[PDB]
Amino acid sequence: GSFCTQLNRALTGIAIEQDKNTQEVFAQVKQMYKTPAIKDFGGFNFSQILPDPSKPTKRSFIEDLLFNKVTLADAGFMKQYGECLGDISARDLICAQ
Amino acid sequence: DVVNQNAQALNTLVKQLSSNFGAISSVLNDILSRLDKVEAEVQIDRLIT
Amino acid sequence: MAQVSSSRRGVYYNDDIFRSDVLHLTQDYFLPFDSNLTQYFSLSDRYTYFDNPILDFGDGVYFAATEKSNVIRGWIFGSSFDNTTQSAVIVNNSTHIIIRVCNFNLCKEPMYTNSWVYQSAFNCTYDRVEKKDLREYVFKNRDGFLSVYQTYTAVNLPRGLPQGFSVLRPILKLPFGINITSYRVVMAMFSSAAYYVGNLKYSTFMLSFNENGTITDAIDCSQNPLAELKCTIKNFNVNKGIYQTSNFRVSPTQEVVRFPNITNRCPFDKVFNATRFPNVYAWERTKISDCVADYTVLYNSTSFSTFKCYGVSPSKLIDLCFTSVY
Amino acid sequence: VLSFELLNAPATVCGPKLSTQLVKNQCVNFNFNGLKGTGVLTPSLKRF
Amino acid sequence: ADTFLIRSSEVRQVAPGETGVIADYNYKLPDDFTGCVIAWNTAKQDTGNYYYRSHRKTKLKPFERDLSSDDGNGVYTLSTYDFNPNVPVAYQATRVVVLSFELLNAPATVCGPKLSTQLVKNQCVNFNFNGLKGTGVLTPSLKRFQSFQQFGRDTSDFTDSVRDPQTLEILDISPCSFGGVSVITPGTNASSE
Numbered sequence A: 001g002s003f004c005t006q007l008n009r010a011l012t013g014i015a016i017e018q019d020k021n022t023q024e025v026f027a028q029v030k031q032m033y034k035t036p037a038i039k040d041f042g043g044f045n046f047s048q049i050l051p052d053p054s055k056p057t058k059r060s061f062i063e064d065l066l067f068n069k070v071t072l073a074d075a076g077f078m079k080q081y082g083e084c085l086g087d088i089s090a091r092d093l094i095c096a097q
Numbered sequence B: 001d002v003v004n005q006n007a008q009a010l011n012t013l014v015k016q017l018s019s020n021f022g023a024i025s026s027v028l029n030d031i032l033s034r035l036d037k038v039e040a041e042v043q044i045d046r047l048i049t
Numbered sequence C: 001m002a003q004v005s006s007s008r009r010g011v012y013y014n015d016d017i018f019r020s021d022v023l024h025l026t027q028d029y030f031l032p033f034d035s036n037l038t039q040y041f042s043l044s045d046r047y048t049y050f051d052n053p054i055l056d057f058g059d060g061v062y063f064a065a066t067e068k069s070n071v072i073r074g075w076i077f078g079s080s081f082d083n084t085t086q087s088a089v090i091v092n093n094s095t096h097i098i099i100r101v102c103n104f105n106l107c108k109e110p111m112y113t114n115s116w117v118y119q120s121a122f123n124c125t126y127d128r129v130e131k132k133d134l135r136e137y138v139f140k141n142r143d144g145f146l147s148v149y150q151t152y153t154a155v156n157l158p159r160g161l162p163q164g165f166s167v168l169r170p171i172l173k174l175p176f177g178i179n180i181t182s183y184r185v186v187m188a189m190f191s192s193a194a195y196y197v198g199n200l201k202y203s204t205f206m207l208s209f210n211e212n213g214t215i216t217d218a219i220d221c222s223q224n225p226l227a228e229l230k231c232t233i234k235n236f237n238v239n240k241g242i243y244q245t246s247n248f249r250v251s252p253t254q255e256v257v258r259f260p261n262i263t264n265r266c267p268f269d270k271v272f273n274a275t276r277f278p279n280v281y282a283w284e285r286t287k288i289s290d291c292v293a294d295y296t297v298l299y300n301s302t303s304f305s306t307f308k309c310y311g312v313s314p315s316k317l318i319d320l321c322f323t324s325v326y
Numbered sequence D: 001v002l003s004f005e006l007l008n009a010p011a012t013v014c015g016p017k018l019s020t021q022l023v024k025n026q027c028v029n030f031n032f033n034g035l036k037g038t039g040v041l042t043p044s045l046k047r048f
Numbered sequence E: 001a002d003t004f005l006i007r008s009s010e011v012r013q014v015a016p017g018e019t020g021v022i023a024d025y026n027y028k029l030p031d032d033f034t035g036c037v038i039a040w041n042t043a044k045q046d047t048g049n050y051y052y053r054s055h056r057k058t059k060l061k062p063f064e065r066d067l068s069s070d071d072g073n074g075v076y077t078l079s080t081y082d083f084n085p086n087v088p089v090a091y092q093a094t095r096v097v098v099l100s101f102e103l104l105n106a107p108a109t110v111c112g113p114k115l116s117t118q119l120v121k122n123q124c125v126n127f128n129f130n131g132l133k134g135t136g137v138l139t140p141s142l143k144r145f146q147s148f149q150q151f152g153r154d155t156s157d158f159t160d161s162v163r164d165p166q167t168l169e170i171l172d173i174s175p176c177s178f179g180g181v182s183v184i185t186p187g188t189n190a191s192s193e
């Protein structure tokens, strides 16, 4: 049992650090300034990096292009578990994990 | 590369279950079905290690 | 026949080794926490339908009895309750403690002050005759050793069974050796009391020892997610947070076996007991297929000089199916 | 000398045990053709 | 001690895990069997007719007896065998005794023939307490055992205290390597102190 409590404690310590890193990087300020209505600040076109009120997502266009670049072939927190009752062609690695 | 490294590590951890570690079989079911556990205890000890 | 919840009762010492100030967990046959026990009633004559049936031993039993004037005396274990099988009796009067294993001719109901326990007994094997109140007992029988655990306390309950934690203690390690399947309860006769019965199940328990060999507290890991968390982290006090848990909840209880319906029997009386075996340099090979292998019809006549198997165990051979045999 | 072997193939020599009813969608102990194990048996759309 | 009398070919059958006709329906050894089995040939001393069980419905549990002869009506299920000095090698009369013994934290009853010696205190000595051998330093102890306790255990399962079988009292055991030592040196080419 002591050979397993160490592994569980180590992995929980890894996971909490992974959760803490995103907290450290992004949330520098605790005041959520709302997006201004205009996007031209003295001739500077900021419409490409600020979110627009015409999309189902609240991300900017460049953020959408960045999110389309990375392919999440690996799974583990978005694939349904009951989907693991497929055929011989559904014998994938994620359901084995 | 980060995502691929994590996926490859998990897949290698899954695929390493096929090694019998010196036992007469990799899976435990035929270890339990083929012998009495007097020596199958010794067989399962190697797999556990 | 009412069901009464038994919260955190039935804890005993499953092992005889000494442990001091440790948090030990083990897998053994225990009484599950908050389980429903059947209630039976008893108290010349006393009052109408106050009797005792034949119960089931299973793999272990928890017997808790409430008494007011010592109406319950003992138990009679057995398998078939006839004199074709052996039985054991553990009853008492005076300060006389009587324990014996014999082939008994049982009465319909045992009364014992007027000592109608048996008519007669024969071929007695093991005899060790030496000589508002809650007494409870646990009986188990493995490897030819009946172990007895009990505890005894004074209460003032008018009705029902009190709740709490109870730890029992070993006294006897009697080597009976008989097959125990069902038992009864021996009640006394004169010139309210009731008992409750629970069965042991294979589960995982965690115990805390108070550095003297005395159990402080016990946790059944299959009761609720809190106890499963406590068994997973191996502690009794849990800090606030979120933790992943292992599997301690589901366990199989039934068996499914499926074999092909090959009813033909292939000759072990012709290959083995042939007319004339050949020379060693002209040894013969015979293919055996499409039959059932018994290996038990040779038990009557032929005794084997040596029978040694490589790759398989001889005891596990009856449960195996083979694809090709030469 | 009895030389016998078992593999992923239909069996011809078996022990004298009687088959029972199969229970589905429950955690059961199974004994399939000499292979013992513990699991949940479900109808399968796979092809052998 | 378990005593019986069997054939000479069945001496292989009294073993943990091995099946046969005696290990199946007459006498089966326990699985985790600690003990010692002894068997010796009396082909001349014991003669006559003896019985064994040949048919039964189920396997026998370990250390389980079965005196139930005549299973049913006239179905005896006790096939007999005979003992004479002319019987072949594998079929001779063998007397079998099984010694099942165990040792644990309890006072001992059966011991070997060894004479006790004087106890030396506050020195690194080899000790032999009730068959438990070890090396350590024996000191008078302020610990408190139970009525049946013979030795105490740590959290690392190391025995730290023992009960003296003669003049019953508790003695503590300490390691001979009594501490951590550091060595402070200059270079060997410079000096040797």
Ligand SMILES: *[C@@H]1O[C@H](CO)[C@@H](O[C@@H]2O[C@H](CO)[C@@H](O)[C@H](O)[C@H]2NC(C)=O)[C@H](O)[C@H]1NC(C)=O
Pocket (backbone or CB within 6 Å): A039, A040, A045, A046, A047, A048, A061
């Ligand atoms: C700012 O630059 C963009 C081009 O990078 C101009 O065009 C817009 O582009 C976005 C997507 O990149 C579209 O959703 C808009 O519909 C486009 N606008 C038009 C008018 O075609 C954008 O016009 C520029 N901003 C201003 C204020 O001129």
Ligand SMILES: *[C@@H]1O[C@H](CO)[C@@H](O)[C@H](O)[C@H]1NC(C)=O
Pocket (backbone or CB within 6 Å): C003, C034, C035, C036
């Ligand atoms: C008593 O408990 C058992 C097991 O928890 C359960 O199966 C049964 O339904 C319960 N009976 C009542 C009347 O609650």
Ligand SMILES: *[C@@H]1O[C@H](CO)[C@@H](O)[C@H](O)[C@H]1NC(C)=O
Pocket (backbone or CB within 6 Å): C081, C082, C083, C084, C105, C106
């Ligand atoms: C007890 O044995 C006798 C014969 O010895 C028999 O007549 C009687 O039926 C038996 N009783 C029981 C309960 O087995």
Ligand SMILES: *[C@@H]1O[C@H](CO)[C@@H](O)[C@H](O)[C@H]1NC(C)=O
Pocket (backbone or CB within 6 Å): C273, C301, C302
């Ligand atoms: C073999 O068979 C013959 C007759 O069929 C019989 O006399 C003999 O005892 C048998 N041998 C064994 C070992 O059973």
Ligand SMILES: *[C@@H]1O[C@H](CO)[C@@H](O)[C@H](O)[C@H]1NC(C)=O
Pocket (backbone or CB within 6 Å): E165, E166, E167
């Ligand atoms: C013998 O044993 C007793 C108690 O077991 C002890 O008191 C005594 O000192 C021992 N030695 C002798 C010489 O009597």
